């Protein structure tokens, strides 16, 4: 028991910048700093924007701020704390059944607003900063209008589905693939987030 360790914190290691006419990924922490920060839970880096790239020891994925909470998928983060300026921060919300977790959003981050457009014309934002058009087909599913290999969506879970105006419609959870090609996406709708809150 003396040698028993705690799980590391989730660490913010970059962001998906959607502020211009061009989407792009930025790294803010390399692997050494990520490892250190995961162990201490102390992250003194300034966080900015809506969509963060987060990492554990085994996965790199996305987390999206909506209504002042930084949301991601349970299959990425599990029950982990997130590193912060004040030390490790415990989850505010944990729901394995929805594949959804959330922490209070980092100081200096920006939150997306939930979509009030009633829009079914969506855009998926990926960990590689691709913006992929998606037509919504139900509460929690949409079809890719432009096929991608499923490998191209690796680490996009936790990122947003946006409406044409840039409002949050949902959090990407998982893709449906045929012969390696993603044809549809499953997501956690923003209403489900609101209910959890
Ligand atoms: Zn909207």
Q: Could you please report the per-residue DSSP string of 148-165?
A: EEGGGGTT-TT-EEE-TT
What DSSP string runs through 91-107? -SEEETTTTEEEEEPPT
Output phi, psi for 25, to 5 deg: -85, 140
Q: Specify the CATH number for the domain of residue 191.
A: 2.40.10.10
Distance CA 81, CA 38 (A): 9
* Closest C-alpha to 171, from 124, 111, 128: 124
Distance CA 31, CA 6 (A): 19
Residues 74 and 120 in one domain: no
To one decimal, the resolution in angstroms is 1.7
Q: How far is the CA of 98 from the centre of ligand 1 (A)?
A: 22
Distance CA 29, CA 40 (A): 15
Q: Which of 90, 112, 134 is the last residue of a domain?
A: 112
Domain span including residue 193 = 113-197
Residues 86 and 2 in one domain: yes
The answer to whether residues 91 and 101 touch, using CB atoms and an 8 Å cutoff, is yes
Residues 42 and 105 in one domain: yes
The answer to whether residues 103 and 92 touch, using CB atoms and an 8 Å cutoff, is yes
Q: Which of 62, 79, 112 is the last residue of a domain?
A: 112
CA dihedral sign, ordered 173, 179, 182, 183: negative
Total number of domains constituting the chain:
2
Residues 7 and 75 in one domain: yes
The 8-class DSSP code of residue 179 comes to: T
Q: How far is the CA of 117 from the centre of ligand 1 (A)?
A: 4
In sequence order, the 6+-apart residues with CB closer than 8 A to the CB of 28 are: 12, 13, 14, 15, 45
Q: Specify the CATH number for the domain of residue 20.
A: 2.40.10.120
Residue given tokens 């006419």 in the structure block: 21
CB count within 10 Å of CB 59 equals: 17
Q: How far is the CA of 76 from the centre of ligand 1 (A)?
A: 27
Residue given tokens 């609101």 in the structure block: 194
Residues 98 and 118 in one domain: no
Give the up-direction half-sphere exposure of residue 174: CA atoms within 13 A in the CB hemisphere: 9
Distance CA 24, CA 94 (A): 29
Report angle CA 89, 40, 100 to the nearest 5 degrees.
Answer: 35
Q: At 81, is the secondary structure helix, strand, or coil?
A: coil
**DSSP3 helix / strand / coil % (the chain, rounded to 5):** 15, 45, 45
**Which residues does the annotation place in the binding site for Zn(2+)?**
115, 117, 163, 167
Residues 6 and 84 in one domain: yes
The answer to whether residues 130 and 144 touch, using CB atoms and an 8 Å cutoff, is no
Tokens of 191: 């209403």
Q: At 77, is the secondary structure helix, strand, or coil?
A: helix
Residues 34 and 58 in one domain: yes
Residues 51 and 16 in one domain: yes
Residues 140 and 77 in one domain: no
Q: Which of 68, 88, 112 is the last residue of a domain?
A: 112
The answer to whether residues 13 and 56 touch, using CB atoms and an 8 Å cutoff, is no
Helical spans, DSSP H, in the chain: 31-40, 74-77, 190-196
Q: How far is the CA of 1 from the centre of ligand 1 (A)?
A: 51
Q: How far is the CA of 59 from the centre of ligand 1 (A)?
A: 30
Report angle CA 5, 7, 9 to the nearest 5 degrees.
Answer: 135
Residues 184 and 195 in one domain: yes
Tokens of 39: 């162990």
Residues 122 and 85 in one domain: no
Q: How far is the CA of 113 from the centre of ligand 1 (A)?
A: 8
Residues 27 and 99 in one domain: yes
The 8-class DSSP code of residue 166 comes to: S
């Amino acid at each position: 028991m003396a040698s028993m360790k705690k799980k590391g914190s989730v660490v913010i290691v970059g962001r998906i910048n959607l502020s211009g006419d061009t989407a792009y990924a930025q790294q803010t922490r390399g692997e050494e700093g990520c490892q250190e920060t995961s162990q201490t839970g102390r992250d003194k880096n300034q966080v900015e924007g809506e969509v963060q790239i987060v990492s554990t020891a085994t996965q790199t994925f996305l987390a999206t701020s909506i209504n002042g909470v930084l949301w991601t998928v349970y299959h990425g983060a599990g029950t982990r704390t997130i590193a912060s300026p004040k030390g490790p921060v415990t989850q505010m919300y944990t729901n394995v059944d929805k594949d959804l977790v959330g922490w209070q959003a980092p100081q200096g981050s920006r939150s997306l607003t939930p979509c009030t457009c009633g829009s079914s014309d969506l855009y998926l934002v990926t960990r590689h900063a691709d913006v992929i058009p998606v037509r919504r087909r139900g509460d929690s599913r949409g079809s890719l209008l432009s096929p991608r290999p499923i490998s191209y969506l690796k680490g996009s879970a936790g990122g947003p589905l946006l409406c044409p105006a840039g409002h949050a419609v949902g959090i990407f959870r998982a893709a449906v693939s045929t012969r390696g090609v993603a044809k549809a996406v499953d997501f956690i709708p923003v209403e489900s987030l609101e209910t959890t809150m």
